[PDB]
Amino acid sequence: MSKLEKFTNCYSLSKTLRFKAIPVGKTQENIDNKRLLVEDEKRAEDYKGVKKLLDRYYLSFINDVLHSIKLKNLNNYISLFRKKTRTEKENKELENLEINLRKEIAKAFKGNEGYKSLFKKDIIETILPEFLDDKDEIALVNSFNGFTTAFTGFFDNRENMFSEEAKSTSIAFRCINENLTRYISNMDIFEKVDAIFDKHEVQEIKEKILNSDYDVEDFFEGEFFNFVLTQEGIDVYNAIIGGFVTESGEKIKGLNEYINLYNQKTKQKLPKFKPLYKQVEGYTSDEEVLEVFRNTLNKNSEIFSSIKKLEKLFKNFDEYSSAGIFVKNGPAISTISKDIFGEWNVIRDKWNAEYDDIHLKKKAVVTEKYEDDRRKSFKKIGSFSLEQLQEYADADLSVVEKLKEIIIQKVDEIYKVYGSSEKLFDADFVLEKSLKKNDAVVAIMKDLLDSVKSFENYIKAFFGEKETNRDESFYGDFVLAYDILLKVDHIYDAIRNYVTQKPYSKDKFKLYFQNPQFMGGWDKDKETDYRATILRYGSKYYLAIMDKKYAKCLQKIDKDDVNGNYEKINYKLLPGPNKMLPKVFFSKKWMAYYNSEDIQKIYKNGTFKKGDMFNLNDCHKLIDFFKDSISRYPKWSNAYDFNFSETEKYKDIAGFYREVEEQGYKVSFESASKKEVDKLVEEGKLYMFQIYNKDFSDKSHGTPNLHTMYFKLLFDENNHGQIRLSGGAELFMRRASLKKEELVVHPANSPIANKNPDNPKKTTTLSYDVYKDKRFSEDQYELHIPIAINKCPKNIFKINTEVRVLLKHDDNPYVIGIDRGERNLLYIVVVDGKGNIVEQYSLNEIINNFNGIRIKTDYHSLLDKKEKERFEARQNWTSIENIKELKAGYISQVVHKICELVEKYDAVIALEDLNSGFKNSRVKVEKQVYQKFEKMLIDKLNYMVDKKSNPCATGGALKGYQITNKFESFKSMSTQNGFIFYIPAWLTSKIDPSTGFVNLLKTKYTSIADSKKFISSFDRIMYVPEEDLFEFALDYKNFSRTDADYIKKWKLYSYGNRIRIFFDWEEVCLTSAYKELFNKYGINYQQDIRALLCEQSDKAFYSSFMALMSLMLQMRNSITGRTDVDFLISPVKNSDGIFYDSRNYEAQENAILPKNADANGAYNIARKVLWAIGQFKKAEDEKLDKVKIAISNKEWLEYAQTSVK
RNA sequence: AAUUUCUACUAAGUGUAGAUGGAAA
């Protein structure tokens, strides 16, 4: 019994099969002549109108009820706010009061004013019919009367407002947390500067025309937050704050405009006010897109005006609070420090040195826990004041002026891009081609939007995310510009969603066939309400839909031996036993059914539920009553063979309900007459589609598609309970999106060309036609049928624990490690329990295995061709989607080459944990693709099943494994999942496998003094001429930052040659390199010569020497221009003494050490997983559920150096 | 370049190999 063989039938799972429904016979002419489509197609197209109406009524309800709202807890909390609470267990009651407040204010919506006659059928039945004015506004709704469930997901998406889900999609969350901040802040700035706007010019002119009472004064004061919760009140507030129109050409100016003019003194520097928020692009026609672009991005657009305004703001950057202004800490810092100071990692280093000077004493060598806590303290830092950067700099470094410099440079680049694009902004310009094919009207669009969005992405940093005092005179105008510049994001993402849109179109609308309950269930008793059924004639399945008013025309039909009989499918599975059993047995129906009192007593107690320790009679009483009622309730026992188990096996009620649902699935067949249903069809009393995909057609011979297998297995005589038809299928239609004047086709007998070079046959000559995108050039009725794999599971138990358990008790574990690479998309090595490379290879060549003869199809050469294609495509918005699809079509053909190894070896998988990786900008599989892969691997491994195997055995369509829990979220991937271990990826490639050596030195030039310190740090530098190598001895106790290594001492060498970076490319041998660096500078070298070295003092030697020493510790030599020279080398001796040169292994069937540097990566990942298994084999069976797997650098190096001796 | 759909195809000729959870927003 292997490990996998136990994992089976673990927990529920739900998939959804899709199928094309071909209409057959004369049902097409039937649905046409009776016009059963256009009613629905219209029902779908105006459904957007009903959405508009529902939105409008919801907003009216919100408005009038928030005219009927008041708030109490604010008057104390606003004062608590400006108090400078500074935590100290006094803002926790702030959190409590604010959460409770957001609760109670949303208690109007969630609680009262109806809200129940809002989300049932009641809405379009009574309310929207009532609340209505236009004849067409009712022509839509009254038409939708009957199909009220078509808003189901729409209804649920409307719950998000009336709750307190702590997200901007809520009512109180927007109108409270995006309101209280701004309202209180504006009232505060009012109390500060309410003395500049005098009475007789602004106050009275805002007094009279607006409200005639509480004119302007009471507005900002205190509790008036209650009145800004409506829409007209908040709108008049937001007009006061910005300016009014007074319904004529007066244009009376607002308070903030008054303070804006008040810089005539040129020294007010008085910040600007801010209104409140409130909750609730083309892509349809070409010229519409072009118009949107030219109208919302031209020289008179608000986006460009805001760019100009923020540029003018940065014209005054220097004269602001050089210490109250903050950049937000995070990824931006990494490039801001690169551009200001010059080097990519300056600010990080400065703060690292500071926190070392503060929290670290003068101890000789740092430790890994201290470094980790320092990085955590760094991430914990909120932001970085510009003044901290002033001191973080060297002298004479104007951080503010450098910032102004780079930012004005960006903006002038924007201007230049505009100057290139004037031809497209000229209102007298016209388009010439189809925008999709056209490029000049897309290449220019991209050159423009890209620069603009890069500026928006670069300036976004200047927030500091929620702080103390800042230059509100700066941030005011800043945010006023930024909230407008943000829209370029949406405009960009709606132009790109069009220049990439496919030529066909998958717009579909759902059929109903004049039945609100269409195809809702598969039940022989309520078929008449559902009016949907399946047939079968051998190996071809059929769907049958009769009509509205003949619903019984599939009942009185018997086989008759006419040499042809359509079968049938019936005999529903049991619905909701846990809850439909109580309502089917406690439905008042005791009037003339039985005579007992104890059963009723323990139900009135509810003691047969939980809340009792244990009872051998209490719950068993309910159970025996149910089982004696099912034997006498003649509507079930007649159908189902109720064969229960014995009484001693029972221990709970959940097991009982599980057993019931197990005994509630008895699908079977009835017969029918072929000519009978045929005449039913011809008479237009039965519309009968075949269910079909490219497998059911006779001419198919190869292996079917997994979902074909699932469907076929839905009716096999082995599908005991595994794959059951979760009722509620639907039936869609989608029009022909291609015009028949556009179709393209390789004509008959024309010898076509074949794209994959490995395929030897270089042509092909079909004797018919190959219509490119045919399936979209015609109507196509497709239907969806859900299923539910393993509805009644047996082996209920946590998986993460039992994989650990089975690992401990196991003696020989296997481990599959996967890691990316620069010359391989994904490299696989699989190791034994002891550290042997059992198998290694690359996955650049997925080898399809069909009909015995295998054809290999590359996937890296393909990706390189598509990339070189992007390189010369002039706009690459559609040549950058093709690659993001090919990759995501290559991590769906490696899932099989992995769920092959897992079955073949009964192993675990080792995946890099992306949360802690730094991939070097040249790995072929970018992070966003790999992150998808891990999700597309958890999902397959969730129900791993082979297609070429026995549908009955283990590992087949009915008994596939479940060896990994349901995927939760991209970030919830940590440290284990079923048979997948999310292990980090530090020091995983630059490490020799034969020794465990690593290079922890800091081998770049800093200063001749530091150079001499590093040189003397060594132990012995003697050019031993017996092998003619330069042996270097070193103790990692000498150099700092070496808290990782464990051997801590090594005898380096100059063995062999290394490859430069220099971009040029230059092979060099290290021995002769040291020879020349000794002779050319004249140091007698046949001897330790460390002292002889430090005699030199020129920067023209040590600088050139430190780089050569870096060249000594490479271990990752490569061309960067050719895949065929990529070798890993180790300048440290093994037990023998010979070094590790991967070239020695490439010409070997199955080496013992990794062949390519990539393979080294997967090897070291698998070894981390092995260390995890080891740590599993030390604890106790009850303590395996706590063992940590986060193999820190120290422990990892300990393992990777002690396990090899 | 044929597909419930996606990807790579031509895979011995109306198709082959993998994968696929859809509807709503």
Ligand SMILES: [Mg+2]
């Ligand atoms: Mg197939």
Ligand SMILES: [Mg+2]
């Ligand atoms: Mg294709």
